[PDB]
Design a protein around this ligand. Structure first.
Ligand code: FES
Ligand code: K
Ligand code: K
Ligand code: K
Ligand code: K
Ligand code: MG
Ligand code: MG
Ligand code: MG
Ligand code: MG
Ligand code: MG
Ligand code: MG
Ligand code: MG
Ligand code: MG
Ligand code: MG
Ligand code: MG
Ligand code: MG
Ligand code: MG
Ligand code: MG
Ligand code: MG
Ligand code: MG
Ligand code: MG
Ligand code: MG
Lengths: 122, 97, 137, 48, 23, 86, 128, 72, 117, 74
RNA sequence: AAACUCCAGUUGACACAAAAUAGACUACGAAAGUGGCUUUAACAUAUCUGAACACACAAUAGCUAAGACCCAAACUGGGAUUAGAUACCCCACUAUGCUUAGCCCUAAACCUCAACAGUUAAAUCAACAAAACUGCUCGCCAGAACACUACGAGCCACAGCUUAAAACUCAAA
């Protein structure tokens, strides 16, 4: 199916960042994935401090990898990302653009619930 | 019979159903700016739908997106990112007197 | 400019200053307001301790420690030792809902310190350790 | 129609040939998923 | 309703369990 | 612990008015539910007891909001008697 | 199981699917789909092999074939999840509902009952 | 009534008339009712399109001096 | 907006388990609760603790603590009158939205009708 | 009460009777005690409003039927 | 009061535990249950009812074996209270709560309201509770107590569970 890899990489210089991305996309291809796109979301401060591979991180490079892969590749890819020392945090989610949003007509108002109690005189 | 009798039909004056501010829009966990508009600035607490004004479907989508973004490293948990404090105030809550 | 209750964000260029010092450089008064005691530690922005006082160190014992006037006295004591070290403006970080939560802050002000901000750091676990069982009274 | 649309997209997919070239092209660009909503339901794109 | 019927059963079971323990 | 400090639950003091800053902070923590949460967490509330409390609090909200809605609806009729003497 | 290269049931009869790039064939194959898509291909094979009208899905034959594919999916699921009591219930209930279908098919159309048993490899058993 | 469809559209397009209803006069005619009567007259002349029968009605009233300020 | 009550109570026709278990019928009474007096607290303690601080430092000699002593007496005088001012306003309803007596006469005219007539 | 004065005058003008005030328990069903053993009750009760001021039926509707008095009512 | 005083506060590092807010939502599941994130598998039945002679499940507690261990905590120990205190109150700590592999098969397992289909008219209807009914089916009930007991039988259960009486006794319950 179509997946989206949200990848936070260690803040590095351009050459080491390209080597990590190439090494990560090749890992996907070795597992049968068809990589569709690679997006750079920019280097930014992390929302909180993240400890990964005996190091503390405050900044990271945010990247996205849109790809198709067999269902069995996800479990194997998660294991690969856990061992790469240049990856702070990598998560694979089902691509949000696959899920089609149903149309919404609007807010149907809810009337006050009726006849909850018998009409006998109390 | 008679021309002046009422005729059966659907209400012509019926107003269109109201829609939430996010009706028809995609809620992504990567859009932290949007998600930040639905958390407390001081505590990061997700606002209930009575404050956000969202429908049930979008309150859930926003809630699930916030939780995903927080634990995936896109959004802080204990406070609203200060970068988004000057964004449009869409929630019905006032903390200053 | 209009007043902002939101603290200045470190790394951005703010105009607010206190005795020529930025918010990131103002010392911190840590108030731990427990149910049976109140502990106050004033530290520098670099985490250097400057003064420590608690209701127990001020000669209060047992249930008298868990009172407002006891915390107010502890605040005055910490403020006095901190003022001698060059502290005027402090950032207050109070954790706990004890009786000395607000009274400990008054003592800091009566002792000659100016509070520029108040921060609550009361620990709230997001799901954490199971607390002790309820009391039968 | 879905096979035709997909057949054009495959031309822009990443391969082992254009991998090094596509990586450098990504490092030079920036993708922004951030936008805000208003009380009237209007999107407010970021100032970039 | 009161628990008077439960209270009878409670005592029977308590005395029964105690008898079994004693013997 | 891993987050930045002096952002969460932080209120700045205006013109040395520390009382108004503390009242504002206390108002923030109350509206977000932290004060009641901290208090309920001092002793463990067993799940059966928590469900009963939530049910009681939800039924009270419905009743209180419905009684308030009726008061506001009838408040216009608190005007002086137009037909005094009849 | 069908080969992974097998196309999806939706894209197998589109004109020109055999001349598209190999990459496009992978993206429309079973290899790039979830297991539920493989079960739809298995259901199609059994229908053509057994039922007279492979397009009639409401016949007692088609229901027995559809349920037999679900039953095999539960058995494969439970082979990896042996403590999944929820799906163990679904399997036992589904086996009982196929026997109730087979009973009714045996009583109404024996010639079709025999082809269903041979095609699906079901050994009908009379209850004790 | 059939004319309620014409009234619903008129209020949407042109809003409520700035002229005030006088519900005491049993023969009062509002701008909407004047619009509805012209709309009915043109329909009886054989025109059957709805969007076209609505635009021609506005022009006729403007020719007669009626003020029709579109809401948007 | 009031929370929904659809499908919340255990009833015939409602498949789900009950969401709410009200111990009282959710039916509006024809009266509101009575104004609940606020728990009292000691006042003027700040001035009281400044006077007693001077006494401690001056061997309980009033001659040295005249300024603080007068301040404590003024706080009590102001607070003593505050007892009369609040009580007068509390009965008048100057600060209350409405008085429970006034709010109940209004509900008497529009009683909730949970029965058919 | 908006029409109490109007109705009382109309009754006097036609030579009939009006009761627009609070209706005390038993005016009809206990009339002999309240007025006297020889009191003559109404032969017809006309309700211009059949509801009381709490939006329930006027008690005299039930009591008129009890006393077998025909009622006209808006 | 006892307890600790290699204690407490700030900062940093750091789980095989538990899962604020959202939730004023009312969803999922046969029930038991299920509210941190991700992915994979996945939620029977194109009439209905139906197994106490079967099959598969079944909160908490508990048993067996090997592990983990923050916190809570039967028992136990100490402090206090009391006429006494085998309790309620305070402190410490264990079995246990967790994981894995097997057992055990019980709950006020109750929303004490069976499944399916249908109705809101007639008599609306003992009372209260959550208005009154119809068709059809299975299950169950027939004064109280003895009795969640005795015996028999079955069961990985051996101080257990399931099924479950009688005698004596009462004129009530
Ligand atoms: S009202 Fe349409 S999605 Fe919220
Ligand atoms: K949580
Ligand atoms: K909640
Ligand atoms: K039971
Ligand atoms: K119950
Ligand atoms: Mg009772
Ligand atoms: Mg007994
Ligand atoms: Mg009750
Ligand atoms: Mg059945
Ligand atoms: Mg069990
Ligand atoms: Mg266990
Ligand atoms: Mg412990
Ligand atoms: Mg232990
Ligand atoms: Mg766990
Ligand atoms: Mg239960
Ligand atoms: Mg039962
Ligand atoms: Mg049944
Ligand atoms: Mg039914
Ligand atoms: Mg009996
Ligand atoms: Mg038992
Ligand atoms: Mg037994
Ligand atoms: Mg036996």
């Amino acid at each position: 199916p179509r997946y989206e890899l949200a990848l936070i990489l260690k803040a590095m210089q351009r050459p080491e960042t390209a080597a990590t991305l190439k090494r990560t996309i090749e890992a996907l291809m070795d597992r049968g994935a068809i990589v569709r796109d690679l997006e750079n979301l920019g280097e930014r401060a992390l929302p909180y401090r993240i400890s990964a591979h005996s190091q503390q991180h405050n900044r990271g490079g945010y990247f996205l990898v849109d790809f198709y892969a067999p269902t069995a590749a996800v479990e194997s890819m998660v294991e690969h990302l856990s061992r790469d020392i240049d990856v702070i945090r990598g998560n694979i989610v089902k691509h949000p653009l696959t899920q089609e949003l149903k149309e919404c007509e609007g807010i149907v108002p809810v009337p006050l619930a009726e006849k909850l109690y018998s009409t006998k005189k109390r | 019979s008679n021309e002046d009798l009422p005729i059966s039909m659907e209400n012509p004056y019926k107003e269109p159903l109201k829609k939430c501010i996010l009706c028809g829009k995609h809620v992504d966990y990567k859009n932290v700016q949007l998600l930040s508009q639905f958390v407390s600035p001081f505590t990061g607490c997700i606002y209930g739908r009575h404050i956000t004004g969202l429908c049930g479907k979008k309150q859930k989508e926003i809630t699930k997106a916030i939780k995903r973004a927080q634990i995936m490293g896109f959004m802080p948990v204990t406070y609203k990112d200060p970068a988004y404090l000057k964004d449009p105030k869409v929630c019905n809550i006032r903390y200053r007197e | 400019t209009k007043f902002s209750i939101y603290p200045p964000i470190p790394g951005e260029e703010s105009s607010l200053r206190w005795a020529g010092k930025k918010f990131e450089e103002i010392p911190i008064a840590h108030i731990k307001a427990s149910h049976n005691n109140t502990q106050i530690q004033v530290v520098s922005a670099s985490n250097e301790p400057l003064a420590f006082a608690s209701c127990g160190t001020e000669g209060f014992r047992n249930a008298k420690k868990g009172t407002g006037i006891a915390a107010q006295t502890a605040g005055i004591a910490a403020a006095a030792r901190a003022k001698q070290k060059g502290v005027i403006h402090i950032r207050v970080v109070v954790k706990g809902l004890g009786p000395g939560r607000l009274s400990a802050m008054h003592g800091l002000i009566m002792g000659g310190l100016e509070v520029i901000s108040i921060t609550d750091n009361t620990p709230i676990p997001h799901x954490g350790c199971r607390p002790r069982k309820a009391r039968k009274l | 129609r879905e096979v035709l649309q997909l057949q054009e997209e495959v031309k822009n997919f990443i391969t082992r040939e254009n991998l090094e070239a596509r990586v450098e092209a990504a490092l030079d660009s920036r993708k922004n998923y951030n936008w805000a909503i208003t009380r009237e339901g209007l999107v407010v794109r970021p100032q970039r | 309703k009161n628990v008077l019927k439960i209270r009878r059963r409670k005592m029977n079971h308590h005395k029964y369990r105690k008898l079994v323990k004693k013997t | 612990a891993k987050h930045l400090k002096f952002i969460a639950r932080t209120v700045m003091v205006q013109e040395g008015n520390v009382e108004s800053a503390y009242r504002t902070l206390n108002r923030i923590l109350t509206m977000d539910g932290l004060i009641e949460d901290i208090k309920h967490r001092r002793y463990y509330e067993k799940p059966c007891r928590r469900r009963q409390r939530e049910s009681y609090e939800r039924c009270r909200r419905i009743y209180n909001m419905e009684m308030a809605r009726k008061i506001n609806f009838l408040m216009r009729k608190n005007r002086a008697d137009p037909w005094q003497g009849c | 199981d069908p080969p992974p290269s097998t196309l999806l049931k939706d894209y197998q009869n589109v004109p020109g699917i055999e001349k598209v790039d190999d990459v496009v064939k992978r993206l429309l194959s079973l290899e790039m789909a979830n297991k539920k898509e493989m079960l739809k291909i298995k259901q199609e094979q059994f229908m053509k092999k057994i039922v007279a009208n492979p397009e009639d899905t409401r016949s007692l034959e088609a229901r027995i074939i559809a349920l037999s594919v679900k039953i095999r999916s539960y058995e494969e699921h439970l082979e990896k999840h042996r403590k999944d009591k929820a799906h163990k219930r679904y399997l036992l209930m589904s086996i009982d509902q196929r026997k109730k279908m087979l009973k009714n098919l045996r009583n109404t159309n024996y010639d079709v009952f025999e082809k269903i048993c041979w095609g699906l490899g079901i050994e009908y058993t009379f209850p004790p | 009534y059939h004319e309620d469809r014409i009234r619903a559209k008129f209020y949407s397009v042109y809003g409520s008339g700035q002229r005030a209803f006088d519900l005491f006069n049993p023969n009062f005619k509002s701008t909407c009712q004047r619009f509805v009567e012209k709309y009915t007259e043109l329909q009886k002349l054989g025109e059957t399109d709805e969007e076209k029968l609505f635009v021609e009605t506005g022009k006729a009233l403007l020719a007669e001096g009626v003020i029709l300020r579109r809401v948007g | 907006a009031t929370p929904s009550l659809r499908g919340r109570l255990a009833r015939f026709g409602n498949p789900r388990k009950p969401v709410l278990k009200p111990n009282k019928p959710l039916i509006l009474a024809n009266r509101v609760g009575e104004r609940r007096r606020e728990k009292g607290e000691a006042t003027c303690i700040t001035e009281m603790s400044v006077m007693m601080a001077c006494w401690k430092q001056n061997e309980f000699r009033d001659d040295a603590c005249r300024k603080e002593i007068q301040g404590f007496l003024d706080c009590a005088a102001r607070a003593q009158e505050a007892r009369k001012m609040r009580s007068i306003q509390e009965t008048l309803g100057e600060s209350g939205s409405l008085l429970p007596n006034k709010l109940n006469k209004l509900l008497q005219r529009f009683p909730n009708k949970p029965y058919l007539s | 009460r908006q029409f109490s004065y109007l109705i009382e005058n109309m009754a006097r003008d036609c030579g009939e009777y009006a009761h627009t005030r609070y209706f005390r328990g038993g005016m009809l069903t206990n009339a002999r005690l309240l007025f006297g053993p020889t009191v003559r009750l109404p032969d017809l009760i006309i309700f211009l409003h059949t509801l009381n001021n709490i939006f329930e039926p006027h008690v005299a509707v039930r009591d008129a039927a009890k006393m077998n008095i025909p009622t006209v009512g808006i």
